[PDB]
Amino acid sequence: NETVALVVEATTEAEAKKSLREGGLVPAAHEIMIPVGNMILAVDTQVLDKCALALAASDDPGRWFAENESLIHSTVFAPVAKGLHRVYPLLSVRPEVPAGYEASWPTQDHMPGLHLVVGGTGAGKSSYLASQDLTLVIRWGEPAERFDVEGATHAVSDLNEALAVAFVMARAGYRPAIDSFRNLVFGIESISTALYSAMTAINNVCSRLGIVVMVVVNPMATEAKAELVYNNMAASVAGMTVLMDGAVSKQTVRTLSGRTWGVGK
Amino acid sequence: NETVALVVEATTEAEAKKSLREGGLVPAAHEIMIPVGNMILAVDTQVLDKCALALAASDDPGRWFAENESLIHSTVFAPVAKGLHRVYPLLSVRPEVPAGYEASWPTQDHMPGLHLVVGGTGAGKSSYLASQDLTLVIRWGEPAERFDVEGATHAVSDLNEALAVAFVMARAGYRPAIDSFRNLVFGIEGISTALYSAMTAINNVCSRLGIVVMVVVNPMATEAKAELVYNNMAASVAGMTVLMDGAVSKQTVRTLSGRT
Amino acid sequence: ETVALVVEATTEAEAKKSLREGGLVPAAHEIMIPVGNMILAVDTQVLDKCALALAASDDPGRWFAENESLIHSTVFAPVAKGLHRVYPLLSVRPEVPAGYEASWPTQDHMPGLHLVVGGTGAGKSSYLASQDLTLVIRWGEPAERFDVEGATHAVSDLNEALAVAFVMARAGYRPAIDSFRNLVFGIESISTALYSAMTAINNVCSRLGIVVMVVVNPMATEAKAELVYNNMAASVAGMTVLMDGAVSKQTVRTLSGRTWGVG
Amino acid sequence: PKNETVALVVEATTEAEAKKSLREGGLVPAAHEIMIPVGNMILAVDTQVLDKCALALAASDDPGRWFAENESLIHSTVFAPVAKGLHRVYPLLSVRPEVPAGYEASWPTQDHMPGLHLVVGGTGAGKSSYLASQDLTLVIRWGEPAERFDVEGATHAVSDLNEALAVAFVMARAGYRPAIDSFRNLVFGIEGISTALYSAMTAINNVCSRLGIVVMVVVNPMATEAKAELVYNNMAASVAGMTVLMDGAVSKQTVRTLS
Amino acid sequence: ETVALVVEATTEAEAKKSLREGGLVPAAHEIMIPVGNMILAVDTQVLDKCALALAASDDPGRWFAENESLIHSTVFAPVAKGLHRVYPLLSVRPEVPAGYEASWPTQDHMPGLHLVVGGTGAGKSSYLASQDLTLVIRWGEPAERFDVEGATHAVSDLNEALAVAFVMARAGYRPAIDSFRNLVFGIESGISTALYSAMTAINNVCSRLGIVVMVVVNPMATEAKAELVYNNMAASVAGMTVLMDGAVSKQTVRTLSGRTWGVGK
Amino acid sequence: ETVALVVEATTEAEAKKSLREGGLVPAAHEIMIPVGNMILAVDTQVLDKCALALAASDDPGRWFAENESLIHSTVFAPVAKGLHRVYPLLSVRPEVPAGYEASWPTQDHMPGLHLVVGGTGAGKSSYLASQDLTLVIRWGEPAERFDVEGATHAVSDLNEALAVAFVMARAGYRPAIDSFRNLVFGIESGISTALYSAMTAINNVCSRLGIVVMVVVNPMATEAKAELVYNNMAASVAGMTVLMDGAVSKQTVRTLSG
């Protein structure tokens, strides 16, 4: 099979042992669960590898995503079965790196995971992305602007599509950025500590996949409370770059050999 | 004759695959989902264009409007299926612009989206609207005034109707405004962040439709935080005009040659 | 024709019926009133039957006690659960009947609510006595001498209170509600849901072309008191503020413009 | 039998069943049923059972013995209807402010409106002490730790709000003088104090008003002693009479009268 | 005669059965105990049966271990869901059995709870060693030396902590419970007022049973709010002892004849 | 045997079955573990089968690698929904098995948790490297160099973290969990008292099993409230080591000598 169950979930033990795609409660070997707030998502790494080969084969990345909505919705989806929260208590994603992983981008020996580009409104976050040699920017949760008609972009509607597009692109060897996680900052309630654990979750999926995804985050903190929040975000992900008035004031990165620190301002 | 499912929703995988209109969980090509707070509405762009074309092509567009209010209103509805929050997590609306879009109103090269007219009580908002040469003010969630009885006005009850009339009018080439988003401010909960993403969602529906809709918003903000609210609201929408004691005190707009 | 109380629509055919019958679609003579997380409905045809029957008798007070079953049919709470989803952020549309005229509470007073506001001891009873009311509808306040002696009708819930005021005002009589205390206490997180609830009730009055005077003690701090009063004023046709027995402030939306009285 | 028991679990699922009494599992009160909203709860008093009890007590040769023998019947005066749509059907429910014809009173003060008479104050203010002066028939003891008095006084101990209201209503209709010590579980159980406490007391006050009785009730609102005056004013704004105690003396008495 | 665990009344005839059988009406020998948003029940008929068996046993500690089943039948949580509606604002009624006498914990001590109160390190558990207790019931505390060498009985939940105390006291023994830490932590609403009503409820069951149960309680109050919290606690129970630096700094007890007070440093 | 995932007890006869089978009554070898509003269960028979196979194995290393799935199944979450009601305010019995003795982490250390506590940067992972551990179990932390090179086992949820720690320690090895970060974040209400009772619960399971498990906890407290928090945590567990600026600033331990 290749479709995702949307409304029929397991009611018997036999059904409960099937894959998340088929409405059961047990991930198949190629399914990875991604907890985000009170939601649970799943990535199917077989469909992901099939999409990554197809993408790298085509003569247009932007055009490929627009005409393959259906495989994108098989790549990352929200399992229908309701007992997942109970069966996997305090679920995270396990910190694990594929063998032979290498990276020169965003920085040398960058651990796979998330690289956050953070700062208040107007810090220069989008001007920062435009100098990182992205293949395209995945646009999510932000009001349409000039860049959306002129730049190398692909617009998405929900977190499944944002993650899926970033995953397929990076597995095909391209460089994605997501602009932005605004809806995750606003959507996760009761700043919430669940935001930090969602970021570790999404980080460690990129880590298991051997990729780095650049992600813009405006955390909506006070000056007073900006330092707290930035230290907690840093402790949650592979890399974080703080922007202030166009320039990097602070950077922290986990690498394959240790850690690197950046102080500007 | 194929109406909107109000109570029966998909129980099987095969029903789950149908359109939101029919009670499934998968948008049809012409359905756009609109997340507002914890609500999910849907615009049917085929019903939308049907209505907008009948309006823009009429010899008497005012009469066609009057005779088809119910049809116009059915353009936006609330899907019945319950798992939509799960299937489309942290839903927003795609930021994209139709090919060949151009605009002169409310300013030159205005990005499609919302244009917010903001301010506190008495700042002169209704006086600013009378100067924008609008076709129609859609009146929602405000107490009946003299305007509601003798102005170029159309009164609605809920958000479905308010967006529907704004969408149809603007697609038919007219200039609509909504007075006001009062019930979003009060109904969604120094103010609720869900208000900002609701405005981005509605902004991007307009952006996808290549239209501009002008909307009145009283954020009901203390004078301290009022500057920070207005900045958060500007970062959510295409354009915003602040009023302070009868005068335009600020205007920021994103355009097709760069955000002024 | 009776109001459905437990059986609601479970099929699309049933859902097309009126609110009275358990459906999700208002008949032409049904108007929905959103109040907090509640949705009520007024049946304008039952309202008009009641308003004619009440104008026939000589005793407005006695008619209401002997017809509890008709007013519970005038304003009721629909049983169907999906109304919140189907009518998102519901309000009531601001519209006016053709040929509406009013000399009371003020000249050309827009139809809607007239709020009489003030804290405890602010002069409320005195002010209603000066407005030549048919009778005061009493709701959610402790019984006092006035309930024994004065021209009153005592109700229990918000349906009854709106029903009685509606039938009275359409029958030409002149009602006041004392008070919206349970609406101030029952709608909270005071909640901005209180302001939209009064806009809703206000525009129901304007669609029926009536004015209903209503006592409200929003009961907030002096500091935040004037901010609350302005928000209430922005929600309704008219508002009168009492303090120390005297009218401190009045705002009225009129058939021409806006009236600002300040004492 | 079948005329006197309350639906505990089965509620109306048809329109014919919904039209029956609250006792029977329906959603429309009988002529003799008064709904009492307390917080998010809805109780009901059956005035017909209440008057059975009050008359048999007031007319008995030995009212003490009749009480002792009919406690379970007395307690069944107030109950909690089983039907779920009541909150929807009766939005923002209160109780009708209304006084029977020919009501007169001398206690607790001359011409005291029917309703609640609150005895309020902080921990140790002398509240239970002040009851000994009001020359009472019975103190109904609810939600308080057992003490001497619960062994040697004119007391009736109860477990829940139904029983407490039931005994106070029956006693006061029989012409006696009851007091509830106390509404502590009202204050705790209803979420500086909740406005729902104020509307609860108005509701219970207006039941007493409709029955032409006065019931004396002890209430410690647990207020900070900065905000206490504001609280005491809101409580007095909700009931017929209020008496505050500080350090063992009456420091304020406000009472609504038939004049 | 066993405890219904999952099947509750669905007919009126079933609803009139006892709490044990899944009904909504206590038998004559059943007392409901409301605790927070929970409702427990003691079966005084099974209680008396156990107190006779325990009294005729050599080893109290060893008897309790071999009788988990009789204990779970002595205090339990009824399965029927409508109890909160049927019994609004439920408490336990204050009444005292005929012919009740007490010399312990003090002379003429009212039946009820005797609270041993303090902050961390106050000497609470050392005070217990001087009250000359049959056995300490250990609940919700990390295991320590005393659990290996001491006269203890370890339990897991509030039912068995109350049951074991009830059976011991009714058989003439002296129970202390160390501690009510999980009430303080478990009961929500500077501490929750529902804690005070829970203590009154448990107090008055003890009262109705004609027993005294000693209970260690750390209310976790800021030193600001300590005298207020202690005063609310004192007003909720028969007796309370406050410890500071190993010594009794405050005491209050309701007796059969009046009130007693103690003041230390 | 296999664990009931979706079908729970509907009759009194089913309700009396084990937690594994969808019932509401623990078997003799099932210990319930309340953690926040969750209730887990450890099956000590599966636990001891796994521990024995590890401890008896010629190459314990490859037995672990080949049997991860089964080890993880040592701890599960019962499907029966009435557990909270039936076991009000659930904790774990404070008991110690007979003949328990311990040389590590300190001499005569009570069985239970040994918390390694501090703020970000305090030096905790470096203190783990000095404790002579068999395995660091990595849970809820972003992937690091350590997760590529070190003596490490990565897990996804609290069931797996507890199961690997229980099985390793029962087999005679020294496990540590890095870290309880998702307990701190996930059990909410300067922090929820529920975190403290969760640690006592897990602590007493370790006590009943006669083991010590070392756990890293960053409670994310303000500098002011820090000492108060650290005091509350030490009151909840067997042992606690506080780290500041790379060094051990405090260590309290409950002992058999006591």
From TrEMBL, chain D:
Can you name one GO molecular function term for this protein?
metal ion binding
Q: In its UniProt record, which GO terms are filed under biological process?
A: viral genome packaging
Q: What is the lineage of its organism?
A: Viruses, Riboviria, Orthornavirae, Duplornaviricota, Vidaverviricetes
Signal peptide position in this chain? none
Which key words tag this protein in UniProt? Answer: Metal-binding
Supply the source organism for this entry. Answer: Pseudomonas phage phiYY
List residues traversing the bilayer.
none
* Boundaries of the shown chain within the full protein: 24 to 288 of 350
Amino acids binding Mg(2+): 128
Q: What is this protein called?
A: Packaging NTPase
From TrEMBL, chain E:
- Transmembrane segments annotated in the record for this chain: none
GO MF terms, alphabetically ordered = metal ion binding
Q: Which UniProt keywords apply?
A: Metal-binding
Q: Where does Mg(2+) bind?
A: 125
Q: Which GO terms describe its biological process?
A: viral genome packaging
Q: What is this protein called?
A: Packaging NTPase
> Lineage, please?
Viruses, Riboviria, Orthornavirae, Duplornaviricota, Vidaverviricetes
